[PDB]
Design a binder for this molecule. Structure first.
Ligand SMILES: [Zn+2]
Ligand SMILES: [Zn+2]
Ligand SMILES: [Zn+2]
Ligand SMILES: [Zn+2]
Lengths: 431, 431
């Protein structure tokens, strides 16, 4: 009877780039449950509304005071006295309280932290860790520790360099435990620093938004041999796969219908999609490239489809800006066989219930699901419990560097330890 | 009666550079209390022992399995059934269990996380937040939110550049609240990115270990005008002071008795201490330089003393590698008037009780105390509660960038909010 939501409180906190974001605390008799909202830099146009203040006098327009106010004065008062166990009911209340398709009234950033923190309070009421609670909500038959995909050379909007494509990842697919995966990842990362420093010098080993090295590289092919060399030097030959996120929307010009591979440089380098596919097929034959995210513009369903079929069985194609963790956009991707993997970003959609529905839809149609961070992260570790709960076997959450990335990896170590040596690890299709 | 320590468990986790460190959980009836140990790169020779495995097959010798084992098999079993409220008694037990001056048997890294987590479990038993509990332990008369000293241009061992000196900091000394201080810090940080990128180009805006920019700067004077320009452009002229950490030990050659200002470069640049003092006095007259940490080698008590007196009243001189948070080394610094400020690093000494004794000794003799992170940090936020509890008014915990830095700043926002608008902010001598 006294087992309901007692208090809801939002505040403005800083993310890992130093920009304001929203954090929410749900207080019950079982404690104070705290969830912070991440923020993207390379954001799809179809993402749910991230609500900013636009006051040029605070954080040059990036304050989240309005979203915080919406938590404190609108959403909070509606949740007091409510049964936190009713995830779908409460998520649906919050959708209706908003009343708009994109969460543009209240903000996906106001709503999401409430959604998240409600589920923490509920897990606690059930007497189970978050990952167990969410796996019941998602109807997951089998927990697993995922293979981490470590963005170790950073480009695009996440890094100070000419490099046009955003993410060059290494994934220890042949590890047999999360423990071993994390150590192998870290070990290759440390070898990679020496390789980059020798090749490009001292000034090349500083880090991007996601903890990856940001070398002075322009050419999109150039990182790949450096990744293989790092893998080998660490003692891990044969044990790794490569994952790519091109984030190609960031380079696309809609009026020219072409991709600028030097958009962060003075002169432009225009490239057709048919010249992009030549490059991708060449990646996939040359390297253990098991995943390619956003190989095309977020509305190029045809390019997406073409490359999903030409690489079927070798290389999964991941919708991120394409799908934006949204069942409507997913349904279009399914219909056109545009891709075969979902990048799941809770803040692309804005409720836990919706993000879970997105995962179930995609896995029912045979896709994989890679739970993801945003490039602007916090100390929050929700996505660690979330990927385990969904049983998907794939997470990208950064290089093994920078606390807003390592916090997630460490939370995965804790979950691992709780589940014991019988706990499943990895993505079966890559193992 | 059932109010004792129930379980103690250590594990290996990753720090913000991706290196292993120790984390400890103390379980009581009131919950699971978790504390992780930080790690330095520019470590004084007088620091308590950080115990590593030296197995070149795991993390090229950097594993903390032995320290974790010492927690799990030696320290843990001794704490079960003990009253967590007895901080000094338990800290002293752990010192005796070690039995060596430097904590070289068990490891300062094994001991410290136990110390920390015991105090969290105790705060919980007392029914008060950590900062309140620690302020009672320290006998603090007045809580305060500190002015943060944001290391925004990174050099030395924390960055990929020629820059020999380690830390160039900005401190919003004229803010009237922690909220405003953090926002001003972030705002100047964002202006600074544009200034560096325009001057040095795109490749210059990637970040060092502590979230500061790592531009291609060699000259130790060159960051200072760039800091002033950033302060001004953000709208904050007159509101900031500069804090320096030279970490000069890292450049010192004992055999030559000189400082190499190009030790990360092919050719050496040898400089006398009398040429270093010329530079410091010039800094202090030219800029609002309110703090200079480790201006000399960790054993140059004479250089330290000379510059403490020549800059008395303008610029505090901070012992870090000099003092290593150790009452023995502090007593020598007091005797020679070597410095007038302590950089307090809990893991330089290895118990909470000792770190507190160090703070009280220094403040009783009239010094300031700047609570500090290490360059290898975690998601742990202990030092946020610690600086508030000690009432010292000064913290350095990184640029407002990278989650292992922003986690501390955000925890300071939470404490601020708990204490209300009557809560004291800042270092009175700088306000
Ligand atoms: Zn993106
Ligand atoms: Zn993406
Ligand atoms: Zn140091
Ligand atoms: Zn220092």
């Amino acid at each position: 009877s006294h087992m309901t939501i007692q208090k809801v409180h939002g505040r403005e906190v800083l993310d890992s780039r130093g920009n304001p974001t929203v954090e929410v605390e749900v207080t019950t008799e079982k404690g104070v449950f705290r969830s912070a909202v991440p923020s993207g830099a390379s954001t799809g146009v179809y993402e749910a509304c991230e609500l900013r203040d636009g006051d040029k006098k605070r954080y040059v327009g990036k304050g989240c005071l309005q979203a915080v106010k919406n938590v404190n004065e609108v959403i909070g008062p509606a949740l007091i006295g409510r049964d936190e166990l009713k995830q779908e009911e409460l998520d649906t209340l919050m959708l209706r309280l908003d009343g708009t398709p994109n969460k543009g009234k209240l903000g996906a950033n106001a709503i999401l932290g409430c959604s998240m923190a409600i589920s923490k309070a509920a897990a606690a009421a059930k007497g189970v860790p978050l990952y167990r609670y969410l796996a019941s909500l998602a109807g997951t038959k089998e927990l697993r520790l995922p293979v981490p995909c470590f963005n170790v050379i950073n480009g695009g909007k996440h890094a100070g360099n000419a490099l046009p494509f955003q993410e060059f990842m290494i994934a220890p697919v042949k590890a047999t435990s999360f423990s071993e995966a994390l150590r192998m990842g870290s070990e290759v990362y440390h070898s990679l620093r020496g390789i980059i420093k020798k090749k490009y010098g001292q000034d090349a080993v500083n880090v991007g938004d996601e903890g990856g090295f940001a070398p002075p590289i322009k050419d999109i092919n150039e990182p790949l041999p450096i990744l293989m060399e790092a893998i080998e030097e660490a003692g891990h030959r044969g044990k790794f796969a490569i994952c790519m996120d091109c984030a190609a929307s960031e380079t696309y010009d809609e009026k020219k219908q072409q991709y600028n591979l030097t958009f962060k440089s003075p002169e432009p380098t225009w490239v057709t999609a048919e010249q992009l596919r030549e490059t991708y097929c060449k990646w996939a034959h040359d390297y253990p490239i098991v995943s390619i995210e956003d190989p095309y513009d977020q509305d190029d369903f045809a390019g997406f489809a073409g490359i999903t079929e030409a690489l079927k069985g070798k290389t999964q194609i991941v919708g991120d800006d394409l799908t934006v963790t949204n069942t409507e956009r997913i349904k279009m991707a399914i219909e056109k066989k545009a891709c075969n993997s979902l990048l799941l970003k809770i803040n692309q959609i804005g409720t836990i219930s919706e993000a879970i529905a997105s995962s179930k839809l995609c896995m029912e149609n045979g896709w994989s699901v890679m739970v993801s961070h945003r490039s602007g992260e916090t100390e929050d570790t929700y996505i660690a419990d979330l990927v385990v709960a969904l049983g998907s076997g794939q997470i990208k959450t950064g290089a093994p560097c920078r606390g807003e990335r390592t916090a997630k990896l460490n939370q995965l170590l804790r979950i691992e330890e709780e589940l014991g040596a019988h706990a499943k690890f990895g993505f079966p299709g890559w193992s």
